[PDB]
Every structure is written in C-alpha cells, then in structure tokens.
Design a protein around this ligand. Structure first.
Ligand code: MG
Ligand code: MG
Ligand code: MG
Ligand code: MG
Ligand code: MG
Ligand code: MG
Ligand code: MG
Ligand code: MG
Ligand code: MG
Ligand code: MG
Ligand code: ZN
Lengths: 96, 49, 72, 86, 136, 99, 116, 128, 23, 122
RNA sequence: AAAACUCCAGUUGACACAAAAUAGACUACGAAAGUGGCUUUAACAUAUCUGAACACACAAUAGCUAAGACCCAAACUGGGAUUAGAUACCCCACUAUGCUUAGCCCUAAACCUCAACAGUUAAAUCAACAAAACUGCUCGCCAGAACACUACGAGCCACAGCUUAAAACUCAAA
C-alpha cells in the first residue's frame, strides 16, 4: 500500500572527480608547477586530455605559462634542467 | 569586518623612515613560491631537498 | 526508497560483505538486507541522530555473531 | 636561438644504439607535432584551406575514436560459435 | 638508470668518453635540406676542421638529393676529421629530407662515434611567409 | 517508443515491467489461442533466436503443432500460390515468442 | 574520450557559428576501412653504397675485397627471401593484427539502424 | 565631478569615520579605486539631488540617470580616444535609448520629465 | 550542375568590361 | 587596485641593489602610489640570453615589489624603468589576490549530441 | 632539365616599424565583418517585442593621395625548359601591394545561402536533396528565361565605378 515509488534525489551517486589543481591557487611565480606540464624535449605545451584538466584550469595554466615565458621565468623551446626530477603526472608513450 | 581586517593589515607597510631595514631584510631573505603536484595533488617544496 | 540511500551509505563506509548473493533463492537475506532490517527496526523506536543509530546497528551486528571483515 | 644548445630536443645513445635513438626522436617529433608542421609550412597555406583541413582532421579524429570505441565495445561477442545451427 | 636527458654543464658529469666529459666534445652540424646537405666538424673551442657537401664529389643535378651522395660526403668529412685527431662528436640535424640519416650512417662508418642525436629544425611560429603553393 | 504505459518504473537504468496489466493481457491472449486450436486451428511458433531453438521445435512436435525457428525466406505465407502449390491452408495463428 | 558536438554542426538551435563543417553526414556505416598496404620499401642502401665504394677502391675483380660484397649479397638474399616467404605463406600472425574479414563480419552482425 | 578625495559609496555608511588615519582614507577613496566607482557616485548623487527617492532601482529615473552617465562616459572616451567606432555606435544607441525613455516619460508623467530636463540640463527635442 | 547562369553572368560582365575598355 | 612588479638586476649584490630599490620606492611614493612590501626571489640564472640593452646578461636577481598603483602612474613607472640602465626589464602586473577561486567541479562526462539528423534511410 | 649567382655557404659573438606554431580534442567575445604572446586603462547599450532603398552609423580583402619603413611573399616585366603555336601550368630577379597617420565608391558564394519576437511535437505525418515539421504580427521581393551585376533618371572628396532600375525582337520554354 505505502510501498509506492518516490522520486527523490536519486542516490547511488559518488562525488564527481575534480581537477588536480582546483583546490589550490595558480600563479605565475610558481615555475615548477607551470613547467611540469611541459614536454621535456620539444618544449611543447600539453593539451587538455594529456594533463587532465577542464576549461578554466587549462586556460589559467596556459595564461600563466605565456606570462612566465614572456616576462622571463620559464623557457618555451625546452624544459628547465633543474626541474627535471618532478613527478610524472601526464601520460607519455615515447621511449616505450 | 573587511575594514577591520584592512586596518589590521595596514599596520605593516613601508614609510619614509623604514627603508634601510626593509631593504636589508629583503636582501637577507629568499622566498620561493615553487611547488609541484603529483597524480593526487600533493605539495612538494624544493627547499626540503 | 530510503533503503537505497541506507545501502549506499553502507557501501561507502564499509563495502562488500563476505557472503555471496544467491539470486536463485527468492527470499535470500544477504548482509545488506539484514543491515537495513536492523536499521529500520532500530529507527522504529524513536531517535533523530543517524550516526548514533548507525554505530548502534554496527555494534549490534558485531556482538551478534557475524563479523564483517572490513578494510583498514 | 637565444636559449641554450644541447638541451632542446636531445637524446642519448647507449651501446651504439643509433637507430633506436633515431626512431625515438622521430616518434617524439611526430607526437609533439613537428614533421607535419614543417610539411604544412613548406609552402604558403591559405587561411580558408587551413580551417577546412583543421575541421576535416577533427571530424576524422572524432570518427576514428567512435569506431575504436565501437570495436572495443563489440569485441565481446566475436569469440567463436556458442550455438550451432539454430 | 641511464637518464635519456642531456647532462647539465654543472658539476659531476659522470660519463667518460676517451678521458673527456660532454661539454669538451667537438660538434658536427649537418644541414639536411630537400635536395642538398652539408657536413661541418667544429671543435669545442670553435675551430673549423672540415666542410663539404654533395657537390664536392662530382654530382650534378638531381643526384644531390640521394642518400648515396650524402653518405659519401659524410664518409669524406669523417676521414678529413680523423686526419687531424678527433674521436667523439655530436651530430646536429637541421631540416628534413631524403638524406637525414645517410650522413649519420656515413659518419658512423667513417670511424666516428656519436652519443647525442639532436635536431634544431628552423621552423618559425607563424613568422615569415613562405613561397606560394605551386599548382601541380 | 511504444513502451511507456507498460512499465511500472526504473531501477538504476533498468525498466521494471508491471505484472498487473501483464497478467490481464496474458489471460486474454491465452483464451484467444484456446478457442482457435479448439476449432481445428493451426499455430506456428516463429521465433528466430539462437539460444532456445531446440526446446521450441520439440514442444510443437510432442503436441502435434507447428514451429518455425529457422531462417525466413521470402514468399512463404505471402506467395503461397507458386511455392507450396496451388491452394494451401495458411496458418490462421502465429505465436511470436521472440519478435 | 570523445569531444562533444553541442555547437559544432550548423543546426536550427545553434545561435553561433559552426566550427566543424563535414562533407558527409556524421552517420557511421557498417563496413570497416581497408588496411594500408602496398608501399615502397627500397631497403639495403648503405650496404650497396659500401659495396660500390670497395669496388671503386680496388680493381674490378672481387678478389681484393670479397668479404664486403659477400656480406652484401648475403644480406640482400636473406632480406629478399624472408620478405617473399612471409608475403607468400603467412598473413595472420599472433593475437591482434590484420583482421578485416572478421571485422566487417562483426560490423554486419551488429549494424546501425538510422531509420529508427 | 567628484573630487579625487571625496569618499565613495562602499565605505560611506560604515562606523568609524575619524578612527582611521590618512593612508587608510587614501586607499579607500577614489585615488585607488576605478571609474565604475565614480560613475556609481555620480548616479547616487543625481538620484539624491534631482529625483525624490534614490532607492528605487527599477524605476525609469534610475534608468535615465544610468543612460546619462553612460553617455557622459562614452563622450569622455571619444574625446580622449579619437578613432573609435564601437564606442561611437554605443554612444549613439545610448542617446537613442535615452531619447526614447524621455519620450515615454513625458507621455506618462510630465512632472518628473521636466524635473529631469531641468536637473540634468538636457532637453528632449522633437525629431523632424 | 548549377553554375551555368553564373558563367553566363561572368561572360556578360567580361564583355561589358571589354567594351568599356575598348573606348 | 593592487599591483606587483618583478625587478631584474645584473650582479651588484648589496650597494647598487639597495640604491636602486630605494630609488624605486621613492619614485612609487612621490608619483602617487603606496608601497606595501618588497620581497626577493633570489639570484638565479636567466632562461635565455638577454643581449637587450648594453652587452651580455646571463645572471640576474629576481625581486617582488607589491604596491597600490593608481591609474595614471603605471605608464610613468614603465617609462622610468625603460629609461634606467640598471634594470633590464619589468612588467607591472596586477596582484592575483583580487581574483578568487570559483566552485568548479572539474571534468564532466559529456553525453552524445544526438537529434542532429532525420529518420531517413537513403 | 634549364636558367639565376660565385662580395656563395657553413659553427661561433654582435641585429627589425606587418606577420604571435604547440595551448587549439577550447566555442569564447562582438549586431555583422572580424578577433586568440605579455603589461595598464576606458569598455561590450536598451525592464514587452517588431519596425527605413522617406535617415544615421559600423562594416573581409583589394585600388588612390603625402610622409615614415622594406627580411620575405608578390600584379606587371626581363631571362630560361616542352609543345606546330604558349602572353599559363616548370625556375630566378624585380615594381605596386602586406605596416602607421588624415581624407575616398562602400565592394563578395558578405554561405550556417535558412530575418527577428515566443512556444509546441503520443491532436499535428512530409514531391526530391539539404540542416525535421508548425502556430500569431511585421519589414523588402517574387510571380516564364536570355536580352539586362544595362543606356537614361535620381545621389556619391570619383569619371574605366557604386545604389535603385527597362523597353524593342526571338522562344511555346526556362
Ligand atoms: Mg558534403
Ligand atoms: Mg604590429
Ligand atoms: Mg528595434
Ligand atoms: Mg616592395
Ligand atoms: Mg623571392
Ligand atoms: Mg573597406
Ligand atoms: Mg563570412
Ligand atoms: Mg544569404
Ligand atoms: Mg526582422
Ligand atoms: Mg547595400
Ligand atoms: Zn585543477
């Protein structure tokens, strides 16, 4: 009798995955954070599906990258040699 | 609350008399806002190595 | 129903039980069914805090006989 | 070229593995987008043709991804013959 | 184990090649285009040692864009460099074409060892305007 | 599309067919097929499915009926004047267990 | 992951500019494309080069430097015979390779129904 | 035209006026503010002096004052920056909208219409 | 396909240009 | 509005560095701005060869000058820094503490955009 | 294959007044055209909607006047291969031109060829393509084709043009 289905909030929903830098602040002073997303060879900037971000995060990342490259804080043609021991976050494929 | 916070923060500025001590403290200090993240989102400071 | 939310919270806190679901038996009482039955029979009393009811049901099922080997 | 020298696009050779390092550099250039970029900049590229070929490549990539997902979804039943005749 | 990245000019460069490190190694610049390539051997302190191309062996037109002429020029440059006194070099690739690895194979067969394979492609970032697209 | 008033609800992207109107339409279908076979009727089980093609054909043979779980050609029940012969009694009832 | 096409195709409910303008409609068929094959190889060039070099160095007779020409001939014969035997007798391989027949068979087994 | 040191609106109806010193009064004034603050101050002064209630934001008088201050800002921008087509079109559209609003107001209420025309100085002309 | 009218208009424009260029 | 300035020098350590910093502070004070703090990032290497102004520059010191600039002084400060020979380069960028973070949920599984073609068979 | 130059090229140190690869698997801003290296400022209108060819304003690129600049590309031109003929497709050099200032006709397949204001599709069902189909109001146009992105007339910092815009004849079509 009282066992009728009730349309509620629909459970069985886990919290959606957020970005790896959504809870922190992104500035141009941090050279290591903006250089970790740079290929340590051709110096190319990785896209969105490689780093694992969205729209606003990737936009802020590339803005900070361009600002650091123009003002004089990070190379564009390669990666900083002193920041080559950073933990690998992006996915690679070269060199097997 | 905002104006009280601003009044509490304005007490640490640079005046006409505090110049030599300020530049000495600035030259005798090295601030580095560099920190990387991993696959989860940890904070790694190069100063600890 | 509310039992769906109860089972969701149970799976989020603990996880899967040691007993295997037997879909061949129409009236198969698994671990989740016993848990939600204990939860509703304790709620039928008269309390408002859900955490107290949850920990009371946990202590009751632990002291009864079944030992849910949870994760660390 | 106002930066350094042997840092940008530089590999290493071990035990005389020159062909392996060459293939690695070629794969790096193809993944980072350089060979196709040079082949496109070999001659003057019209902006209309540029946008047209970009849209074509995007549509082709989307179609290839859809086909790959369809293959990975349908590879569950291409095993053998469960029921003979019927 | 074995870092694929080039070592810093820094301190403690823990690789030895004939009693030398990595900075004191002569450089071998190769400009491989679409029909002609040039090979030059320059020392660490910047001194020219040898220089030739595909037209220094008797090749006229068309045949300059062949890997055989590139390998011959590379072997000749390696011989001219060995006549003085060099062992380890560093090849530099400039541009793409049919003779991109032929010069490297010639330098290897001539008697020179390579440890680093770099490439500095002179490609601008929306810079100068190239020639118009020809109608084939 | 034509499947909305016949579903009671969903259970995690799984529709639940209501058994209230199902049993109502089932008895009206079993009673319709009962009077057909009572007056010398001909049934035919047409269900092209490769999983239970053996059980369907045997139930029609033990009871003296007709089954058809094989491939359907073209001019079977439609063009029966130039295939099975001159005059052929077409089955007045076809049971679709698997449409 | 595949990118979404909310405002890509120029439709009636897109108050902006279309970015992707394909020639054919975005409706997949029931057949897979043919694998790439029949390309120019022209392998073994440095061996022929050094053979010509050792021929031009000594006289025309192959008695002064027979090792180089012998190795060149051996390598060329091995490569040619291997390629011929492969392309003649073996075309399958191991797990995951050139599979067009079964691919199109599976595509026709589960085709697309664009007409609802 | 408000002076550079006249105290804006965000830090006006707050307790403690003389409790601060000089640097706090300068940082919270128009010296370290923006042009939007000056526009809001002009709008508030107009709504407090010309019309009666300066609280109604959905009324026609607030819209007229906003259009007038936008017209003034566009005129100042065109006087400072010569070649500017988008700002010129925006100024023309704002003038047209202000004229239409003045026409509607005069059609529905002549008292506030003449009050605005006497206060702001502009006069609604009859289009030929 | 549907370019005959456009080619006719182009020919007419070319004839008019040749006419205004002659005199 | 709050702004920040990154000062770059060319090897002078203490005397000339302090002199130029005092000059910049006095300029920011008498031009119409208020200096907040003055930090120093250290003395590291340059990412590229700067042969801009005079001859070779490959080793400088990075600084941070936080202040409140108005609306008619940043251009004058840029002109003063460009006319000065000691400072190589420096841009007066706004302070990032003004813009806060939003409530972004990160990535999101986008669905399949259907309802784009008719039910034709062709 | 010519032809073009040998004060030609190569590594090192010293250099620009248009042109901002990767980010860009992003769909954003702007009425449209159009626009994505960095630093600062002004700023992206309208509390119902629609509405001028009886008006105003903006507006891809190219072409003009006078000054400042010129690496490279390039109308034209000169030279050089093939063809019976090549004023084009094959190669090199060069002029106007790609840049900023003030003044000009406002030109396109200005194409997403789909006008704006709102909603609807189990009452409504479409020749065929293409991007599925309607209800209420409004602006300019149509009702056979070439003749005609045309003379004249009405305006245009221009006299090789732009905006509006036909008649006569043939055809039983387009
Ligand atoms: Mg098409
Ligand atoms: Mg410019
Ligand atoms: Mg209107
Ligand atoms: Mg010129
Ligand atoms: Mg040229
Ligand atoms: Mg124009
Ligand atoms: Mg357009
Ligand atoms: Mg149109
Ligand atoms: Mg309209
Ligand atoms: Mg017009
Ligand atoms: Zn993030």
């Amino acid at each position: 009798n009282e066992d009728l289905p009730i349309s509620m909030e629909n459970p069985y929903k886990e919290p959606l995955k957020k970005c790896i830098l959504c809870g922190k602040h992104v500035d141009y002073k941090n050279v290591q954070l903006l250089s970790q997303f740079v290929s340590p060879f051709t110096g190319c900037i990785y896209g969105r599906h490689i780093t694992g971000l969205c729209g606003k995060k990737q936009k802020e990342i590339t803005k900070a990258i361009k600002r650091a490259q123009i003002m004089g804080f990070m190379p564009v043609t390669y990666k900083d040699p002193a920041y080559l021991k950073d933990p690998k976050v992006c996915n690679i494929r070269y060199r097997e | 609350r905002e104006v009280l916070q601003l009044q509490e923060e304005v007490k640490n500025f640079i005046t006409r008399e505090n110049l030599e001590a300020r530049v000495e403290a600035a030259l005798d200090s090295r601030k580095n806002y560099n920190w990387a993240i991993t696959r989860e989102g940890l904070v790694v400071r190069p100063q600890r190595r | 129903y509310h039992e769906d939310r109860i089972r969701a919270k149970f799976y989020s806190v603990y996880g899967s039980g040691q007993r295997a679901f037997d879909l061949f038996n129409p009236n198969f009482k698994s671990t989740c069914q016993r848990f939600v039955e204990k939860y509703t029979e304790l709620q039928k009393l008269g309390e408002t805090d859900e955490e107290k009811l949850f920990v009371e049901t946990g202590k009751a099922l632990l002291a009864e006989g079944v030992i849910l080997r949870r994760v660390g | 070229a106002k930066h350094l020298k042997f840092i940008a696009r530089t590999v290493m050779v071990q035990e005389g593995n020159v062909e392996s390092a060459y293939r690695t550099l070629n794969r790096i250039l193809t993944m980072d987008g350089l060979i196709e970029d040079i082949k496109h900049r070999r001659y003057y590229e019209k902006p209309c043709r540029r946008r047209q070929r970009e849209s074509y490549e995007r549509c082709r990539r989307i179609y290839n991804m859809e086909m790959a997902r369809k293959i990975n979804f349908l590879m569950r039943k291409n095993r053998a013959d469960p029921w003979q005749g019927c | 184990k074995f870092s694929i990245y080039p070592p810093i000019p820094g301190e403690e460069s823990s690789l030895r090649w004939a009693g030398k490190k990595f900075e004191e190694i002569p450089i071998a610049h190769i400009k491989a285009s679409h029909n002609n390539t040039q090979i030059q051997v320059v020392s660490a302190s910047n001194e020219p040692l040898a220089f030739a191309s595909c037209g220094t062996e008797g090749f006229r037109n068309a045949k300059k864009g062949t890997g055989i002429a590139a390998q011959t020029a590379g072997i000749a440059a390696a011989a001219r460099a060995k006549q003085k006194g060099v062992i380890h070099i560093r090849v530099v690739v400039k541009g793409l074409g049919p003779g991109r690895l032929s010069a490297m194979h010639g330098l290897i067969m001539g008697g020179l060892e390579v440890i680093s394979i770099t490439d500095n492609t002179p490609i601008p970032h929306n810079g100068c305007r190239p020639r118009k697209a020809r109608k084939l | 599309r034509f499947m909305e008033p016949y579903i009671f609800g969903s259970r995690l992207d799984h529709d639940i067919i209501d058994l209230e109107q199902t049993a109502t339409h089932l008895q009206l279908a079993l009673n319709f097929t009962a009077h057909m076979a009572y007056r010398k009727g001909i049934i035919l089980f047409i269900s092209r499915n490769r999983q239970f093609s053996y059980l369907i054909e045997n139930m029609a043979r033990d009871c003296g009926e007709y089954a058809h779980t094989r491939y359907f050609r073209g001019g079977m029940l439609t063009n029966a004047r130039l295939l099975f012969g001159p005059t052929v009694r077409l089955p007045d009832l076809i049971i679709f267990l698997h449409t | 992951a595949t990118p979404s096409l909310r405002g890509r195709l120029a439709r009636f409910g897109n108050p902006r500019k279309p970015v992707l303008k394909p020639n054919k409609p975005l409706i997949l068929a029931n057949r897979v494309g043919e694998r790439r094959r029949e390309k120019g190889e022209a392998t073994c060039i440095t061996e022929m080069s050094v053979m010509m070099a050792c021929w031009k160095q000594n006289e025309f007779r192959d008695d002064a430097c027979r090792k180089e020409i012998q190795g060149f001939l051996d390598c060329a014969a091995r490569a040619q015979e291997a390629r011929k035997m492969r392309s003649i007798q073996e075309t399958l391989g191991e797990s995951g390779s050139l599979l067009p027949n079964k691919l199109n068979k599976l595509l026709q087994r589960f085709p697309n129904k664009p007409y609802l | 035209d408000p002076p550079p040191s006249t105290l804006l609106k965000d830090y006006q109806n707050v307790p403690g006026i003389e409790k601060v010193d000089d640097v706090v009064k300068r940082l919270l004034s128009l010296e370290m503010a923006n042009k939007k603050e000056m526009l809001k101050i002009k709008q508030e002064q107009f709504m407090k002096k010309i019309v009666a209630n300066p609280e109604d934001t959905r009324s026609l008088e607030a819209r007229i004052i906003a259009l007038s201050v936008k017209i003034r800002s566009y005129e100042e921008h065109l006087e400072k920056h010569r070649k500017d087509k988008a700002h010129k079109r925006y100024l023309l559209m704002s003038i047209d909208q202000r004229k239409k609003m003045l026409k509607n107001l005069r059609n529905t209420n002549y008292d506030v219409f003449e009050k605005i025309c006497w206060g702001l100085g502009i006069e609604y002309t009859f289009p030929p | 396909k549907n370019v005959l009218k456009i080619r006719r208009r182009k020919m007419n424009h070319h004839k008019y240009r040749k006419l205004v260029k002659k005199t | 509005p709050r702004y920040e300035l990154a000062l770059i020098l060319k090897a002078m350590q203490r005397p000339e560095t302090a002199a130029t910093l005092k000059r910049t502070i006095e300029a920011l004070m008498d031009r119409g701005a208020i200096v907040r703090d003055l930090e120093n990032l250290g003395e590291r290497a340059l990412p590229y060869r700067i042969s801009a102004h005079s001859q070779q520059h490959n080793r400088g010191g990075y600084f941070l000058v936080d202040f409140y600039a108005p609306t008619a002084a940043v251009e004058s400060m840029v002109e003063h820094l460009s006319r000065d020979i000691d400072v190589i380069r420096g841009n007066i960028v706004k302070h990032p503490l003004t813009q806060e973070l939003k409530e972004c949920e990160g990535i999101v599984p986008v669905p399949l955009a259907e309802k784009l073609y008719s039910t034709k068979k062709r």
